[PDB]
Design a protein around this ligand. Structure first.
Ligand SMILES: NS(=O)(=O)c1ccc(C(=O)NCc2ccc(F)cc2)cc1
Ligand SMILES: NS(=O)(=O)c1ccc(C(=O)NCc2ccc(F)cc2)cc1
Ligand SMILES: [Hg+2]
Ligand SMILES: [Zn+2]
Length: 258
């Protein structure tokens, strides 16, 4: 009746309404470190988030999104495997009901507690709607989260969750700095893929960072307290909102380091 991550409308049923689910460049995938190709022509990543304007945070029934003002080149992504300028529009996480699961991409079959997705679109296309009709329209920066010590920069996000507990709720969320969520190194793996939720459009250049960020048990616990349902509907905790690794098919994963 609408997709989800439940037994009856989860990832394994998505192909019925979204045929592209069995496509050739679907994400996420397992990153086999020994088979990825060191490509020395890949340039270093350029992250310019100093003029970033966050606006709102909302629970959309599948995850929570922090939205940004993308009317101008305030927060961009360039370099690496990219051609042109990509504007940050929003970021979200995927996580599990337990620490040994949660990420979408895996490294040598290893799953992390959660995964962060910073979503950007190609400025050459004018608006996001046009970008989703192109093979090089989007660029998502993936960052793994492992459980250990607390991440200061994440607490601001964790505190506001109580006000967006149920589907459809949103809270004002200004002056948040996304730079606080970055690992120390910007080394990455890259490959051509797709959105990991319906409509699953194959319009994404994936950039997965090698170095994960550390978050505390308490911080991750608060993500698990959110709800998939709207207010007044029976309660279903928001956990395990991640799609299983897909076949690599005819693709090659290139690394920016050896
Ligand atoms: N400029 S703003 O802060 O108000 C803004 C923020 C987020 C979004 C969004 O998440 N929708 C994405 C989206 C919508 C349609 C598509 F075809 C592709 C992506 C849209 C506008
Ligand atoms: N987990 S992920 O990074 O892959 C991801 C990023 C963005 C979106 C999205 O904007 N959906 C809206 C949307 C609606 C209609 C469209 F035609 C296109 C996008 C979905 C998944
Ligand atoms: Hg596309
Ligand atoms: Zn995502």
């Amino acid at each position: 009746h609408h997709w989800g991550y439940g037994k009856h409308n989860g990832p394994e049923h998505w192909h019925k309404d979204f045929p592209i689910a069995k496509g050739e460049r679907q994400s996420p995938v397992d990153i086999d470190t020994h088979t990825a190709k060191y490509d020395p022509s890949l340039k270093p990543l350029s992250v310019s988030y100093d003029q970033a304007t966050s606006l709102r945070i909302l629970n959309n029934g599948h995850a929570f999104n922090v939205e940004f003002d993308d009317s101008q080149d305030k927060a961009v992504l360039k370099g690496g495997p990219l051609d042109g300028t990509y504007r940050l529009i929003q970021f979200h996480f995927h996580w599990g009901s337990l620490d040994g699961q949660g990420s979408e991409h895996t490294v040598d079959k290893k799953k992390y507690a959660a995964e962060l997705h910073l979503v950007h679109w190609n400025t050459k296309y004018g608006d996001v709607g046009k970008a989703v009709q192109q093979p090089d329209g989007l660029a998502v920066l993936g960052i793994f989260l492992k459980v250990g010590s607390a991440k200061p920069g994440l607490q601001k996000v964790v505190d506001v969750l109580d006000s967006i507990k149920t589907k459809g709720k949103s809270a004002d969320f200004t002056n948040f700095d996304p730079r606080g969520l970055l690992p120390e190194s910007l080394d990455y793996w890259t490959y051509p893929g797709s959105l990991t939720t319906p409509p699953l459009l194959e319009c994404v250049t994936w950039i997965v960072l090698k170095e994960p960020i550390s978050v505390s048990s308490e911080q991750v616990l608060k993500f698990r307290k959110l709800n998939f349902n709207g207010e007044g509907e029976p309660e279903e905790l928001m956990v395990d909102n991640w799609r299983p690794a897909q076949p690599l098919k005819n693709r090659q994963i290139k690394a920016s380091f050896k």
